[PDB]
Amino acid sequence: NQQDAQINLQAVKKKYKEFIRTFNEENFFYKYRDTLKRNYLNGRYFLEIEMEDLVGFDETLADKLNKQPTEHLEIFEEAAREVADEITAPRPEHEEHMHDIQILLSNPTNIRQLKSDCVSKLVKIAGIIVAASGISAKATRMSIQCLSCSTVIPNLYALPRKCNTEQAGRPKCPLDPFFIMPDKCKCVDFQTLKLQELPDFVPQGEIPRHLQLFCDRSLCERVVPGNRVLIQGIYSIRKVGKAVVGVRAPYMRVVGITVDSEGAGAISRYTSDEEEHFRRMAASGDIYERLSQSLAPSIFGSRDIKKAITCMLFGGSRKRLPDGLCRRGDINVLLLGDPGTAKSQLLKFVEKVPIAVYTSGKGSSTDPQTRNFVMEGGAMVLADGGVVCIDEFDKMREDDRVAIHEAMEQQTISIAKAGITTTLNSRCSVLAAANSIFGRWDDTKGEENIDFMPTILSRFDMIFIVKDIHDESRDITLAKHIINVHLSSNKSAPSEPAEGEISLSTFKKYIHYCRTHCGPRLSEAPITVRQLEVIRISESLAKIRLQPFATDEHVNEALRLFQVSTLDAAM
């Protein structure tokens, strides 16, 4: 109790506690005080605070606090418990027992700026998460048979010479009869967190550097990779010294990160006016052919045939049976043709317009730490509800072309590198893109576009080819569909003014209601076995007209779209 300065107590003595009990303005709302109450709505055992409210009281703690928070934040812990435990009952008549807590703080900086000077010090910076480990273990105390004292620890030595199997007369017991007894112990968490620097601070001629992090109790299970963070930590150490002389320890820990809310993407992890938006357009029975000029909302293609998408994104219905089979609710569609038609950028947009990945061939596609063989998996990762559209089928190795035959016609998945069998499946699908042989002159004739199999042309449906067909009338138009489309690089906003050819995000959630209600069906009702086996698109229209049911031949609208394809394999 050296009360001249640096006192051991003042904070928990009267001060920080009383600051808490002074954080008080009227309405009877201005509190740092009932916060934890509504934390106690569940037993959260934490609380958030600022770095510029102490300054609202003083100028003396701010500098004294930020220096040795390794002490102050546990002073604050003690203040917290010894204040809050008053609250379990006004007078002595309710308590199971107290418990443990947390306190959480809140100008940014970078990684290439902080060094030997910036040690034992609190900081604000911002980065981008990479990956990190699991949740293992840590305690605060336990004890030993030999003396049975709660093994008090400074920091989250090994019982020197005193044994305490000792006072039995003489008979002695040197050199540690200390069997650590964890049944008496305490317990904490861990994650060991991770960051990458910005894409703005010279990783180009140089290398992008980074460092490791360290967490404690409740702040794991909070953060996963592909996110963007702001933080406060400590520049602290793990090694010792005086390594040709003394090279040593980087890391940090956490105190109180603050993460980002980047705009409009993250309806991913953490309204009914929009339903009124949704439904009064579908009240109009003008969506089937209206949104045949929407899926390419700003450029030309598939125009009168884009109606055939209405079945696929909603899909049919994975109509299980009493018998064995789980039918092909997944169903596949095709494109194929030459470049120049905007076929590269169109599907580029389609990733923007549910969830997938997009490139073609060899570019997805068949650690030095804690001796566990990780395996991140296969191709249902982003596609089990997500579906894809990709080029270069034959333009790909044939080792990773068995899987497609297992993936696709059935999702007949399995594993054989080690000895265990992933029995995976998915509600997924693909489209194909192309630059294979000779296009429209090929499609009418026979069957050699792919130079290995007749299988393909097996379990696929509509054959809609991409061409740059000579049409002198349309030559000038697409000679003029292309300049200001490119030039001024301007086609952003005025596509959304359409009736229902609009509002990509609204469309995303239109759809993620539309299919996402139930397994609707149909009504009672050249016409071959495979073309037939389109019955799944008989099912489709009840999500397209949003019916329960429909009959055969009003939805043979698609047959007018498919007979276009049949000319390829007419005879």
Partner 1 sequence: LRNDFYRQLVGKRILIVVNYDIDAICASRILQALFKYDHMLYTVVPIMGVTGLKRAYGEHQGDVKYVVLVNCGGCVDIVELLQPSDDVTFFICDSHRPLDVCNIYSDRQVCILGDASLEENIPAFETIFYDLKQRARRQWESERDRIMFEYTQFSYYGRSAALMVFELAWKLSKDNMDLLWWAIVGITEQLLLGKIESGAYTLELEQIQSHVSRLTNKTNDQNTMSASKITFENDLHLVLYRHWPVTESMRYSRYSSCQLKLWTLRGEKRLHELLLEMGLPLVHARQTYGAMDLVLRKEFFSMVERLAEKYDIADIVYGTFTLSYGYRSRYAAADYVYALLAIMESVKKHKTPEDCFLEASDALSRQHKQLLSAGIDQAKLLHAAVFRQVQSSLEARQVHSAGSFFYYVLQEEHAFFSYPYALGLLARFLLRGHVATSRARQASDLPLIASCPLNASEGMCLLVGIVPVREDSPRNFFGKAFEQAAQKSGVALLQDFFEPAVVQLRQSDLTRFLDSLTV
Partner 2 sequence: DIATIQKLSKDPRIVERVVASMAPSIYGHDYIKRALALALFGGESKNPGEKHKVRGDINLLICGDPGTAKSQFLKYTEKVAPRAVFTTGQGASAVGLYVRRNPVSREWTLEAGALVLADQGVCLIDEFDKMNDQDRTSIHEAMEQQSISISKAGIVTSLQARCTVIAAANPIGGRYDPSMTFSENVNLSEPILSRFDVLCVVKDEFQLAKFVVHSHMKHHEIPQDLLRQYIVYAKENIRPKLTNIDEDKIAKMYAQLRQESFATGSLPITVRHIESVIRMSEAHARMHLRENVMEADVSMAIRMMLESFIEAQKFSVMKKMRSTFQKY
Ligand X SMILES: Nc1ncnc2c1ncn2[C@@H]1O[C@H](COP(=O)(O)OP(=O)(O)O)[C@@H](O)[C@H]1O
Give the interface with ligand X as residue ranges (CB under 6 A).
Answer: 299-300, 339-345, 435, 478, 481-482, 485-486
| Residue 4 partner contact from ligand X, partner 1, partner 2, none using kind-dependent CB cut-offs of 5 to 8 Å | none
Q: Compute the least distance from the CB of residue 118 to partner 2, in Å.
A: 24
Q: Compute the least distance from the CB of residue 376 to ligand X, in Å.
A: 30
Of the candidate residues 2, 4, 52, 398, the single one contacting partner 1 (CB under 8 A)? 52
Closer by beta carbon to ligand X, 345 or else 547: 345
327 annotated as ligand-binding? yes
**Cβ contact 157:201 at 8 Å:** no
Of the candidate residues 345, 412, 421, 547, the single one contacting partner 2 (CB under 8 A)? 345
* Tokens read off for 82: 């010894």
Of the candidate residues 2, 41, 63, 325, the single one contacting partner 1 (CB under 8 A)? 63
Closer by beta carbon to ligand X, 208 or else 340: 340
Q: Compute the least distance from the CB of residue 66 to partner 1, in Å.
A: 9
Angle, in degrees to the nearest 10, between helices 504-514 and 272-282: 80
Closer by beta carbon to partner 2, 298 or else 563: 298
**Cβ contact 543:570 at 8 Å:** no
Q: Compute the least distance from the CB of residue 193 to ligand X, in Å.
A: 41
Per-residue buried b or exposed e for 501-514, using 16+ beta carbons within 10 Å of the residue's own CB: bebeeebebbeeeb
| Residue 300 partner contact from ligand X, partner 1, partner 2, none using kind-dependent CB cut-offs of 5 to 8 Å | ligand X
Which helix (H) or strand (E) segment is 128 a member of? Answer: strand 125-129
Binders of partner 1 among residues 95 to 114 (CB under 8 A) are 107
Q: Compute the least distance from the CB of residue 458 to ligand X, in Å.
A: 25
| Residue 57 partner contact from ligand X, partner 2, partner 1, none using kind-dependent CB cut-offs of 5 to 8 Å | partner 1
Q: Compute the least distance from the CB of residue 206 to partner 1, in Å.
A: 22
Contact window for partner 1 (CB under 8 A) among 57-65, 401-409, 464-472, 527-535: 57-65
Biggest alpha carbon–alpha carbon distance for the chain: 113
Closer by beta carbon to partner 1, 123 or else 544: 123
Rounded CA separation 245/463 (Å): 71
Binding mask 370-389 for partner 2 (x = CB under 8 A): ----x-x-------------
Q: Compute the least distance from the CB of residue 443 to partner 2, in Å.
A: 19
Rg (CA), the chain: 33
**Cβ contact 293:452 at 8 Å:** no
**Positive or negative, the Cα torsion across 379, 380, 381, 382?**
positive
Q: Compute the least distance from the CB of residue 241 to partner 2, in Å.
A: 19
Rounded CA separation 489/483 (Å): 9
Rounded CA separation 49/302 (Å): 57
Binders of partner 2 among residues 393 to 432 (CB under 8 A) are 395, 400
Binders of partner 2 among residues 200 to 229 (CB under 8 A) are 203-205
Closer by beta carbon to ligand X, 277 or else 467: 467
Q: Compute the least distance from the CB of residue 435 to ligand X, in Å.
A: 6
Q: Compute the least distance from the CB of residue 128 to partner 1, in Å.
A: 23
Alpha helix (H) residue ranges in 40-128: 61-67, 69-84
Residues 6 or more apart whose Cβ sits within 8 Å of residue 451: 394, 437
* Residue pointed to by tokens 């060991």: 192
* Residue pointed to by tokens 């509190």: 31
333: DSSP letter = E
Per-residue buried b or exposed e for 402-428, using 16+ beta carbons within 10 Å of the residue's own CB: ebeeebbeebebeeeeeeeeeebebeb
**Cβ contact 445:403 at 8 Å:** no
| Residue 274 partner contact from partner 1, partner 2, ligand X, none using kind-dependent CB cut-offs of 5 to 8 Å | none
Closer by beta carbon to partner 1, 121 or else 508: 121
Note whether 59 binds partner 1 by CB under 8 A. yes
| Residue 59 partner contact from ligand X, partner 2, partner 1, none using kind-dependent CB cut-offs of 5 to 8 Å | partner 1
**Cβ contact 120:68 at 8 Å:** yes
Specify which residues 336 forms β-bridges with.
465
| Residue 343 partner contact from ligand X, partner 1, partner 2, none using kind-dependent CB cut-offs of 5 to 8 Å | ligand X
Note whether 25 binds partner 1 by CB under 8 A. yes
Closer by beta carbon to partner 1, 69 or else 315: 69
Rounded CA separation 556/566 (Å): 14
Pairing between β-strand 388-390 and β-strand 430-432 as defined by DSSP bridges: parallel
Rounded CA separation 366/389 (Å): 19
Of the candidate residues 240, 283, 479, 570, the single one contacting partner 2 (CB under 8 A)? 479
Q: Compute the least distance from the CB of residue 22 to partner 1, in Å.
A: 9
Closer by beta carbon to partner 1, 52 or else 183: 52
DSSP secondary structure string, 439-489?
HHHHHTS-S-SSSS-SSSSSS---EEEE-----HHHHHHHHHSSHHHHTT-
CA 230 to chain centre: 18
Of the candidate residues 412, 484, 516, 523, the single one contacting partner 2 (CB under 8 A)? 484
Question: Residue 132's closest CA among 203, 214, 189?
Answer: 214
Q: Compute the least distance from the CB of residue 346 to ligand X, in Å.
A: 8
| Residue 362 partner contact from partner 2, ligand X, partner 1, none using kind-dependent CB cut-offs of 5 to 8 Å | partner 2
CA separation, residue 2 to residues 5, 6, 9, 58, 63 (Å): 7, 7, 9, 22, 20
| Residue 183 partner contact from ligand X, partner 1, partner 2, none using kind-dependent CB cut-offs of 5 to 8 Å | none
Residue ranges for the known binding site for ADP are 327
Site for partner 1, rule CB under 8 A: 23, 25-26, 30, 52-53, 56-57, 59, 62-63, 107
Site for partner 2, rule CB under 8 A: 130-131, 199, 203-205, 298, 339-340, 344-345, 348-349, 352, 357, 359, 361-369, 374, 376, 395, 400, 435, 470, 472, 475-476, 479-480, 482-484, 486-493, 495, 504
